């Protein structure tokens, strides 16, 4: 029989031990240790120089936690007690108790410099200011996860009688605006793999029936999530809700398989923390405990790469066997052009709506454009070698720089395709007319 | 009950090469048999 | 396994008896009694000064019924026969039979001065004029409930696979417009709980497994519904595409608990009739049977109230105990400021789109603004008494009148907060400058 | 319980044999035969003038197929192997193998003049140009069916956790546009009958676990589908999301019931092919197996009609032995007026947006308007003969031409209703003023 749970992102179960992590992210991590019927909570940072690490005794059993650059929020799901602790001492630590119905429990909490949110098993949404003053109350499908950035908030909802779904909204000073509300989520539930209920796995899924390791906004403010498919998913076109679509941008199983030399090693797992441009920030976990353990390892990094390869063909092309596979130029150029295109489009959306957030992204986009045309030129040259005039000409239309078109003319001459040379220069004339206009 | 089929009919209504061959067939058949 | 069933608003089961109520509302109530192989139906009105109570014998077993100020509509879910009776003698009573498929049944019906509507278990929607002239046929999910106001129609649907959903539309004289079409509906569901196998509960869920009791449009033309958990739910912001949301505006269980002296008087139940401004018309039912009994008890009224309340805090603050429990000034001010803001916004939406329907709403709106600022001034003074300058300053921004800020300045002076006095004076100067633009 | 399977438009199982149909449409059909460990494929056309029937051998055991008047697309659901064949010789065929996760399989495939699409059980969507150049990958609900007509594409999606849904899009070379994205679908499911009846047609449900018998675009690009209940459904007003709606336009069972003289000739089955304006192209299949066999029997033609009738009432009206049942003129006129109205509206929308293809369709629209007024005049005259002036006057508002209103005046004179003559002439004068304005 199914059962609802309280949850916090990137924390861990106890296993059999007396300690666990409540939540973890690129700014820091929260850990706790059991001291008889009392608990010690510690807030740690990946910049302890800026932010004092601090610890205190939890006499309440806080089972919910949220960490940001200003403070840490704690909650007790049964009693409804909550507590906020700023990292500084300019702002006070403060506590509050939230009303709860019989059998109702707080399922998730979130806090930003401009908004605070609480959710419950009976689908009630409550919002507050940074002092705990209430703003509003709303009724939804049951809420199972929350995350936020400035006024932007992303929520996940689930019921057997309404399905699995999400909401995207911005709690602006004008009003709460819904981009999407309780729209179906295209993510594989862990219980689809019903037969994998081994003892070590069963503890984790009793701790986290949803299976999701984390959910967060990108460095560019885009929603992202990592599920039981061991794949990182990113929501594209979220700023344009008519056009929104989820993209699988990185599979950890494929990467670890390749990194092992194309081998099925059952021994290493990835714990995600945050996505920064093209690179996932994550912790590498090993062995039966698929959740990270104590002492916490040092963070690692991994690049996003598109799911566009076949294992058997990769092994045959590769044919020191543990060294990562040698990928053909065709496959490499293919994935490069797709990844360049995806990254350029997402960054374009970022800059067109929110501007330069770091002050250099124009350079990144220019570099991506160069990589894109160079990838296409590799694929074009391969097509010319195959003498497929139509496919070669189709690829020519996708280039962006007249330098690349000129290089394509040279390649066509080397390929001895005068018809293709003529048609490419017709395209260059057409683009020159477009450049004149 | 009120009939309107005539009302509907008046409301609704608001030599060829084909025919010559039919006349020829008619003439041919009648000529063959008559005394 | 599950079976779809017919519904009429605020009608009762039979219980262990030969009589029941078919439907009840602000216009009147329809009751019936068994007489051998026949039934006698009586149409009673809460204004028999305008209307006349009348009765007739039913040989068809009309298991569905709907009442308005023009007439009464009757229907048979199995045979598909329907009948409409105007209250006047100007226009005649008439009957019709709807073309139901094998295995199909009519689930609910509705009538307005311009239209008559029929819905079925197999999701077929059929529409007619007040004489029975047909207009169209349309297909949805299985329909489970219906209600209407002039041209506005509000429909509820259920599927084993699509879940629970609702639609809101207007049969405009130009064309039919959908405001929402089978969007998910957030009501609580009773039947999974084993406690529902109590005798009185089990009869209702045999009579009505949905657990809904009634649904209707507000006194300002907004959808409202009363569900299995005895909470009144209102669809807010329905005129706004990106803001439409369901609001829990009254917990009758909480009101009974307080009004009984903080006591668990589960021998009391509420039967809803209609909503007028901030006050719900209802019957207060007492005894085991949760539905009203024979002869019909008298109308009662209850106010909508925001869910701020905590039982333990109210008991402690309160500590003849049957008298309604004490509410602190902080809770009262918080609840008033939320309720005043909600009422003002709903009424604003009404006047901007529906205008003054009653000819006094500008006066109510002015009173609501005064109540809003006064409630915030109480909370402001509390923050000043706590010497929290930031919280007091944030509360000062919420005040509307410059007169309110003048009061806030004087409160700040007596609270000995000169920094707050200076900052509020800056706000008053800034607002006066803005008023001079 | 449900399980995922491949599909193609109107294929057949093997049954007891070594051959089957892979798919059918208006252009043609595809068949294949098994030869020990190899397969032979044959391609047929109804336009024998335009195309050549041909055949070739498959060693790989394709199980997916898609046809248009440019070429044919073939696929293997387990191995991921695919092939596209133009109808011309000039553009040589090409092949590719697509990556698949463990146990993943291709469920459907489709193609436009320049776009290639693939879907899988695990909800992955992949797309390529006409020369196999990859464009994009997306993660959605699992797809169960696909169809296309020029640049317009229509998709169906289903999940245990998200219900049944559909999408509509237009892959314009200027730009790609979405009209609907995985919005709920009201289709009739077959699972209850499959679980209870044990009819020995289980092989068809194994072959088609969705029971979606076929789907295609109309002869004017409207989306259409044929249900497991053997009913034809069409989506109207798709260009306007607040007005878009599903319409039931033909029940095959009701036609066979009348055709048989009101009898239950369940030995007869209807196999749909394509929709041509107002007429269904179909095969009438007799015997054990509800789908056709080789050599292909000749097709039939059948008109759509609105569902308005009742078996018992028509039997009573009726009451040589197989003679088709006689119908009241009221039902016939009513059905005609509804059918004329729907047809005219759909044709009008087509002309409003896409214009005439041939230069004469406006004349058909004029004929439909004439039929509409003619049907209304018969219904009006019936109301007048019944002396129901109120209903007759309400019907008179719906007439278009003053010719018909003049006939209505004559009808009123025959009915000896000078009040109705007066009020019709008031309406005629009012409408004449509106025509003068």
PDB file of C-alpha atoms in Angstrom, chain C residues 171-386:
ATOM      1  CA  UNK C 171     -23.184  29.156 -23.943  1.00  0.00           C
ATOM      2  CA  UNK C 172     -22.678  32.634 -25.334  1.00  0.00           C
ATOM      3  CA  UNK C 173     -25.186  33.953 -27.844  1.00  0.00           C
ATOM      4  CA  UNK C 174     -22.375  34.193 -30.408  1.00  0.00           C
ATOM      5  CA  UNK C 175     -20.783  30.828 -29.553  1.00  0.00           C
ATOM      6  CA  UNK C 176     -20.000  28.375 -26.761  1.00  0.00           C
ATOM      7  CA  UNK C 177     -16.838  29.400 -24.868  1.00  0.00           C
ATOM      8  CA  UNK C 178     -14.742  27.126 -22.640  1.00  0.00           C
ATOM      9  CA  UNK C 179     -13.002  28.916 -19.772  1.00  0.00           C
ATOM     10  CA  UNK C 180     -11.599  25.627 -18.456  1.00  0.00           C
ATOM     11  CA  UNK C 181     -12.018  22.195 -20.075  1.00  0.00           C
ATOM     12  CA  UNK C 182     -11.514  19.006 -17.994  1.00  0.00           C
ATOM     13  CA  UNK C 183      -8.861  20.573 -15.804  1.00  0.00           C
ATOM     14  CA  UNK C 184      -8.097  18.530 -12.639  1.00  0.00           C
ATOM     15  CA  UNK C 185     -10.360  19.093  -9.595  1.00  0.00           C
ATOM     16  CA  UNK C 186      -8.737  19.137  -6.073  1.00  0.00           C
ATOM     17  CA  UNK C 187     -11.487  17.680  -3.792  1.00  0.00           C
ATOM     18  CA  UNK C 188     -10.730  15.264  -0.927  1.00  0.00           C
ATOM     19  CA  UNK C 189     -11.995  11.648  -1.294  1.00  0.00           C
ATOM     20  CA  UNK C 190     -13.592   9.687   1.653  1.00  0.00           C
ATOM     21  CA  UNK C 191     -14.058   6.093   0.543  1.00  0.00           C
ATOM     22  CA  UNK C 192     -10.519   4.730   1.099  1.00  0.00           C
ATOM     23  CA  UNK C 193     -10.915   5.248   4.866  1.00  0.00           C
ATOM     24  CA  UNK C 194     -12.360   2.215   6.671  1.00  0.00           C
ATOM     25  CA  UNK C 195     -14.201   4.590   9.048  1.00  0.00           C
ATOM     26  CA  UNK C 196     -16.664   5.307   6.197  1.00  0.00           C
ATOM     27  CA  UNK C 197     -18.250   1.863   6.843  1.00  0.00           C
ATOM     28  CA  UNK C 198     -20.303   3.375   9.682  1.00  0.00           C
ATOM     29  CA  UNK C 199     -24.021   2.870   8.974  1.00  0.00           C
ATOM     30  CA  UNK C 200     -24.938   6.519   8.336  1.00  0.00           C
ATOM     31  CA  UNK C 201     -21.767   7.082   6.293  1.00  0.00           C
ATOM     32  CA  UNK C 202     -22.138   3.867   4.279  1.00  0.00           C
ATOM     33  CA  UNK C 203     -25.690   4.746   3.206  1.00  0.00           C
ATOM     34  CA  UNK C 204     -24.573   8.105   1.808  1.00  0.00           C
ATOM     35  CA  UNK C 205     -21.712   6.585  -0.192  1.00  0.00           C
ATOM     36  CA  UNK C 206     -24.097   3.941  -1.539  1.00  0.00           C
ATOM     37  CA  UNK C 207     -26.439   6.824  -2.415  1.00  0.00           C
ATOM     38  CA  UNK C 208     -23.579   9.086  -3.564  1.00  0.00           C
ATOM     39  CA  UNK C 209     -20.097   7.487  -3.707  1.00  0.00           C
ATOM     40  CA  UNK C 210     -18.586  10.824  -4.803  1.00  0.00           C
ATOM     41  CA  UNK C 211     -19.345  12.283  -1.364  1.00  0.00           C
ATOM     42  CA  UNK C 212     -20.245  15.701  -2.791  1.00  0.00           C
ATOM     43  CA  UNK C 213     -23.265  17.299  -1.105  1.00  0.00           C
ATOM     44  CA  UNK C 214     -23.985  20.287  -3.375  1.00  0.00           C
ATOM     45  CA  UNK C 215     -22.515  22.779  -5.845  1.00  0.00           C
ATOM     46  CA  UNK C 216     -23.757  26.184  -7.004  1.00  0.00           C
ATOM     47  CA  UNK C 217     -22.755  29.622  -8.255  1.00  0.00           C
ATOM     48  CA  UNK C 218     -22.114  32.391  -5.737  1.00  0.00           C
ATOM     49  CA  UNK C 219     -24.331  35.453  -5.282  1.00  0.00           C
ATOM     50  CA  UNK C 220     -21.854  37.024  -7.779  1.00  0.00           C
ATOM     51  CA  UNK C 221     -21.776  34.183 -10.342  1.00  0.00           C
ATOM     52  CA  UNK C 222     -18.613  32.284  -9.218  1.00  0.00           C
ATOM     53  CA  UNK C 223     -18.462  28.439  -8.923  1.00  0.00           C
ATOM     54  CA  UNK C 224     -18.745  26.970  -5.413  1.00  0.00           C
ATOM     55  CA  UNK C 225     -18.859  23.403  -4.069  1.00  0.00           C
ATOM     56  CA  UNK C 226     -19.181  21.559  -0.729  1.00  0.00           C
ATOM     57  CA  UNK C 227     -17.381  18.214  -0.561  1.00  0.00           C
ATOM     58  CA  UNK C 228     -16.881  15.086   1.532  1.00  0.00           C
ATOM     59  CA  UNK C 229     -14.699  16.852   4.144  1.00  0.00           C
ATOM     60  CA  UNK C 230     -17.441  19.468   4.817  1.00  0.00           C
ATOM     61  CA  UNK C 231     -15.287  22.356   3.503  1.00  0.00           C
ATOM     62  CA  UNK C 232     -16.728  25.080   1.266  1.00  0.00           C
ATOM     63  CA  UNK C 233     -14.526  25.557  -1.810  1.00  0.00           C
ATOM     64  CA  UNK C 234     -14.760  28.551  -4.162  1.00  0.00           C
ATOM     65  CA  UNK C 235     -13.035  29.018  -7.517  1.00  0.00           C
ATOM     66  CA  UNK C 236     -11.223  32.352  -7.320  1.00  0.00           C
ATOM     67  CA  UNK C 237      -9.732  34.371 -10.204  1.00  0.00           C
ATOM     68  CA  UNK C 238     -11.730  32.363 -12.781  1.00  0.00           C
ATOM     69  CA  UNK C 239     -11.909  35.485 -14.964  1.00  0.00           C
ATOM     70  CA  UNK C 240      -8.036  35.515 -14.975  1.00  0.00           C
ATOM     71  CA  UNK C 241      -6.270  32.881 -17.185  1.00  0.00           C
ATOM     72  CA  UNK C 242      -2.963  32.703 -15.249  1.00  0.00           C
ATOM     73  CA  UNK C 243      -4.476  33.168 -11.749  1.00  0.00           C
ATOM     74  CA  UNK C 244      -7.615  30.967 -11.476  1.00  0.00           C
ATOM     75  CA  UNK C 245      -7.343  28.963  -8.247  1.00  0.00           C
ATOM     76  CA  UNK C 246      -9.443  27.034  -5.714  1.00  0.00           C
ATOM     77  CA  UNK C 247      -9.692  28.618  -2.246  1.00  0.00           C
ATOM     78  CA  UNK C 248     -10.755  26.797   0.987  1.00  0.00           C
ATOM     79  CA  UNK C 249     -12.939  29.554   2.468  1.00  0.00           C
ATOM     80  CA  UNK C 250     -14.833  27.767   5.278  1.00  0.00           C
ATOM     81  CA  UNK C 251     -14.238  24.657   7.408  1.00  0.00           C
ATOM     82  CA  UNK C 252     -17.618  23.805   8.937  1.00  0.00           C
ATOM     83  CA  UNK C 253     -15.958  21.199  11.175  1.00  0.00           C
ATOM     84  CA  UNK C 254     -13.776  23.905  12.730  1.00  0.00           C
ATOM     85  CA  UNK C 255     -16.803  26.159  13.241  1.00  0.00           C
ATOM     86  CA  UNK C 256     -18.779  23.354  14.903  1.00  0.00           C
ATOM     87  CA  UNK C 257     -15.756  22.524  17.070  1.00  0.00           C
ATOM     88  CA  UNK C 258     -15.353  26.122  18.249  1.00  0.00           C
ATOM     89  CA  UNK C 259     -19.076  26.906  18.519  1.00  0.00           C
ATOM     90  CA  UNK C 260     -19.642  23.728  20.560  1.00  0.00           C
ATOM     91  CA  UNK C 261     -17.047  24.988  23.065  1.00  0.00           C
ATOM     92  CA  UNK C 262     -13.972  23.359  21.593  1.00  0.00           C
ATOM     93  CA  UNK C 263     -15.778  20.012  21.483  1.00  0.00           C
ATOM     94  CA  UNK C 264     -16.084  16.998  19.194  1.00  0.00           C
ATOM     95  CA  UNK C 265     -19.847  17.179  18.561  1.00  0.00           C
ATOM     96  CA  UNK C 266     -19.904  14.797  15.582  1.00  0.00           C
ATOM     97  CA  UNK C 267     -23.670  14.441  16.174  1.00  0.00           C
ATOM     98  CA  UNK C 268     -24.002  17.731  14.159  1.00  0.00           C
ATOM     99  CA  UNK C 269     -23.842  18.047  10.346  1.00  0.00           C
ATOM    100  CA  UNK C 270     -24.322  20.875   7.810  1.00  0.00           C
ATOM    101  CA  UNK C 271     -26.443  20.667   4.629  1.00  0.00           C
ATOM    102  CA  UNK C 272     -25.556  23.472   2.135  1.00  0.00           C
ATOM    103  CA  UNK C 273     -28.126  25.530   0.201  1.00  0.00           C
ATOM    104  CA  UNK C 274     -26.600  28.722  -1.299  1.00  0.00           C
ATOM    105  CA  UNK C 275     -23.966  31.444  -0.766  1.00  0.00           C
ATOM    106  CA  UNK C 276     -24.889  35.111  -0.158  1.00  0.00           C
ATOM    107  CA  UNK C 277     -21.936  37.534   0.227  1.00  0.00           C
ATOM    108  CA  UNK C 278     -19.780  36.114   3.106  1.00  0.00           C
ATOM    109  CA  UNK C 279     -22.525  33.888   4.560  1.00  0.00           C
ATOM    110  CA  UNK C 280     -23.650  30.387   3.557  1.00  0.00           C
ATOM    111  CA  UNK C 281     -27.295  29.289   3.745  1.00  0.00           C
ATOM    112  CA  UNK C 282     -27.565  25.780   5.212  1.00  0.00           C
ATOM    113  CA  UNK C 283     -29.485  23.296   7.392  1.00  0.00           C
ATOM    114  CA  UNK C 284     -27.912  22.159  10.671  1.00  0.00           C
ATOM    115  CA  UNK C 285     -28.678  18.422  10.921  1.00  0.00           C
ATOM    116  CA  UNK C 286     -28.497  16.530  14.233  1.00  0.00           C
ATOM    117  CA  UNK C 287     -28.453  12.779  14.938  1.00  0.00           C
ATOM    118  CA  UNK C 288     -26.949   9.688  13.337  1.00  0.00           C
ATOM    119  CA  UNK C 289     -28.325  10.252   9.827  1.00  0.00           C
ATOM    120  CA  UNK C 290     -26.094  12.899   8.242  1.00  0.00           C
ATOM    121  CA  UNK C 291     -28.864  14.115   5.836  1.00  0.00           C
ATOM    122  CA  UNK C 292     -31.840  16.298   6.924  1.00  0.00           C
ATOM    123  CA  UNK C 293     -34.957  14.447   8.073  1.00  0.00           C
ATOM    124  CA  UNK C 294     -38.791  14.736   7.785  1.00  0.00           C
ATOM    125  CA  UNK C 295     -40.422  17.301   8.136  1.00  0.00           C
ATOM    126  CA  UNK C 296     -37.655  19.552   6.803  1.00  0.00           C
ATOM    127  CA  UNK C 297     -35.744  21.488   9.536  1.00  0.00           C
ATOM    128  CA  UNK C 298     -35.395  25.275   9.399  1.00  0.00           C
ATOM    129  CA  UNK C 299     -32.803  27.304   7.402  1.00  0.00           C
ATOM    130  CA  UNK C 300     -29.621  28.462   9.179  1.00  0.00           C
ATOM    131  CA  UNK C 301     -26.604  30.612   8.245  1.00  0.00           C
ATOM    132  CA  UNK C 302     -22.815  30.545   8.778  1.00  0.00           C
ATOM    133  CA  UNK C 303     -19.980  32.953   7.874  1.00  0.00           C
ATOM    134  CA  UNK C 304     -16.892  32.112   5.800  1.00  0.00           C
ATOM    135  CA  UNK C 305     -13.637  32.311   7.783  1.00  0.00           C
ATOM    136  CA  UNK C 306      -9.941  31.896   6.960  1.00  0.00           C
ATOM    137  CA  UNK C 307      -8.073  28.803   8.331  1.00  0.00           C
ATOM    138  CA  UNK C 308      -5.768  30.498  10.858  1.00  0.00           C
ATOM    139  CA  UNK C 309      -6.977  28.467  13.828  1.00  0.00           C
ATOM    140  CA  UNK C 310      -4.951  26.120  16.083  1.00  0.00           C
ATOM    141  CA  UNK C 311      -6.973  24.102  18.626  1.00  0.00           C
ATOM    142  CA  UNK C 312      -4.284  23.882  21.330  1.00  0.00           C
ATOM    143  CA  UNK C 313      -3.445  27.601  21.246  1.00  0.00           C
ATOM    144  CA  UNK C 314      -7.128  28.555  21.319  1.00  0.00           C
ATOM    145  CA  UNK C 315      -7.759  26.194  24.257  1.00  0.00           C
ATOM    146  CA  UNK C 316      -4.774  27.629  26.144  1.00  0.00           C
ATOM    147  CA  UNK C 317      -5.821  31.218  25.395  1.00  0.00           C
ATOM    148  CA  UNK C 318      -9.395  30.415  26.453  1.00  0.00           C
ATOM    149  CA  UNK C 319      -8.037  28.798  29.642  1.00  0.00           C
ATOM    150  CA  UNK C 320     -20.356  27.020  30.609  1.00  0.00           C
ATOM    151  CA  UNK C 321     -17.389  25.849  28.493  1.00  0.00           C
ATOM    152  CA  UNK C 322     -19.831  24.938  25.675  1.00  0.00           C
ATOM    153  CA  UNK C 323     -19.701  28.657  24.755  1.00  0.00           C
ATOM    154  CA  UNK C 324     -17.536  29.435  21.724  1.00  0.00           C
ATOM    155  CA  UNK C 325     -13.821  29.488  22.507  1.00  0.00           C
ATOM    156  CA  UNK C 326     -11.907  32.773  22.755  1.00  0.00           C
ATOM    157  CA  UNK C 327      -9.793  34.000  19.818  1.00  0.00           C
ATOM    158  CA  UNK C 328      -6.740  36.261  20.485  1.00  0.00           C
ATOM    159  CA  UNK C 329      -6.534  39.761  18.992  1.00  0.00           C
ATOM    160  CA  UNK C 330      -3.531  38.678  16.906  1.00  0.00           C
ATOM    161  CA  UNK C 331      -5.463  35.764  15.393  1.00  0.00           C
ATOM    162  CA  UNK C 332      -8.591  37.900  14.968  1.00  0.00           C
ATOM    163  CA  UNK C 333      -6.656  40.702  13.250  1.00  0.00           C
ATOM    164  CA  UNK C 334      -4.765  38.258  11.013  1.00  0.00           C
ATOM    165  CA  UNK C 335      -7.953  36.420  10.036  1.00  0.00           C
ATOM    166  CA  UNK C 336      -9.773  39.714   9.405  1.00  0.00           C
ATOM    167  CA  UNK C 337      -7.009  41.171   7.223  1.00  0.00           C
ATOM    168  CA  UNK C 338      -6.934  37.995   5.131  1.00  0.00           C
ATOM    169  CA  UNK C 339     -10.740  37.794   4.908  1.00  0.00           C
ATOM    170  CA  UNK C 340     -11.094  41.518   4.151  1.00  0.00           C
ATOM    171  CA  UNK C 341      -8.469  41.294   1.405  1.00  0.00           C
ATOM    172  CA  UNK C 342     -10.114  38.194  -0.108  1.00  0.00           C
ATOM    173  CA  UNK C 343     -13.621  39.689   0.014  1.00  0.00           C
ATOM    174  CA  UNK C 344     -12.455  43.005  -1.450  1.00  0.00           C
ATOM    175  CA  UNK C 345     -10.662  41.275  -4.332  1.00  0.00           C
ATOM    176  CA  UNK C 346     -13.599  38.993  -5.176  1.00  0.00           C
ATOM    177  CA  UNK C 347     -16.002  41.936  -5.002  1.00  0.00           C
ATOM    178  CA  UNK C 348     -13.630  44.056  -7.124  1.00  0.00           C
ATOM    179  CA  UNK C 349     -13.634  41.354  -9.800  1.00  0.00           C
ATOM    180  CA  UNK C 350     -17.443  41.320  -9.625  1.00  0.00           C
ATOM    181  CA  UNK C 351     -17.823  45.079 -10.075  1.00  0.00           C
ATOM    182  CA  UNK C 352     -15.215  45.230 -12.842  1.00  0.00           C
ATOM    183  CA  UNK C 353     -16.985  42.497 -14.879  1.00  0.00           C
ATOM    184  CA  UNK C 354     -20.532  42.056 -13.486  1.00  0.00           C
ATOM    185  CA  UNK C 355     -21.030  45.590 -12.091  1.00  0.00           C
ATOM    186  CA  UNK C 356     -23.139  46.440  -9.064  1.00  0.00           C
ATOM    187  CA  UNK C 357     -25.634  43.578  -8.998  1.00  0.00           C
ATOM    188  CA  UNK C 358     -27.356  44.841  -5.820  1.00  0.00           C
ATOM    189  CA  UNK C 359     -26.602  48.586  -5.724  1.00  0.00           C
ATOM    190  CA  UNK C 360     -24.614  48.826  -2.478  1.00  0.00           C
ATOM    191  CA  UNK C 361     -21.264  47.131  -3.186  1.00  0.00           C
ATOM    192  CA  UNK C 362     -19.181  50.330  -3.329  1.00  0.00           C
ATOM    193  CA  UNK C 363     -20.241  50.854   0.294  1.00  0.00           C
ATOM    194  CA  UNK C 364     -19.238  47.309   1.276  1.00  0.00           C
ATOM    195  CA  UNK C 365     -15.942  47.838  -0.557  1.00  0.00           C
ATOM    196  CA  UNK C 366     -15.223  51.060   1.353  1.00  0.00           C
ATOM    197  CA  UNK C 367     -15.991  49.305   4.648  1.00  0.00           C
ATOM    198  CA  UNK C 368     -13.709  46.408   3.676  1.00  0.00           C
ATOM    199  CA  UNK C 369     -10.808  48.791   3.014  1.00  0.00           C
ATOM    200  CA  UNK C 370     -11.297  50.371   6.440  1.00  0.00           C
ATOM    201  CA  UNK C 371     -11.396  46.949   8.101  1.00  0.00           C
ATOM    202  CA  UNK C 372      -8.270  45.913   6.179  1.00  0.00           C
ATOM    203  CA  UNK C 373      -6.174  48.893   7.325  1.00  0.00           C
ATOM    204  CA  UNK C 374      -7.517  48.650  10.885  1.00  0.00           C
ATOM    205  CA  UNK C 375      -6.589  44.958  11.120  1.00  0.00           C
ATOM    206  CA  UNK C 376      -3.111  45.733   9.783  1.00  0.00           C
ATOM    207  CA  UNK C 377      -2.782  48.543  12.334  1.00  0.00           C
ATOM    208  CA  UNK C 378      -3.471  46.043  15.132  1.00  0.00           C
ATOM    209  CA  UNK C 379      -0.759  43.749  13.770  1.00  0.00           C
ATOM    210  CA  UNK C 380       1.500  46.780  13.262  1.00  0.00           C
ATOM    211  CA  UNK C 381       1.044  47.886  16.884  1.00  0.00           C
ATOM    212  CA  UNK C 382       1.848  44.334  17.999  1.00  0.00           C
ATOM    213  CA  UNK C 383       5.083  44.405  15.978  1.00  0.00           C
ATOM    214  CA  UNK C 384       5.939  47.804  17.475  1.00  0.00           C
ATOM    215  CA  UNK C 385       5.226  46.481  20.979  1.00  0.00           C
ATOM    216  CA  UNK C 386       7.631  43.629  20.150  1.00  0.00           C
TER     217      UNK C 386
END
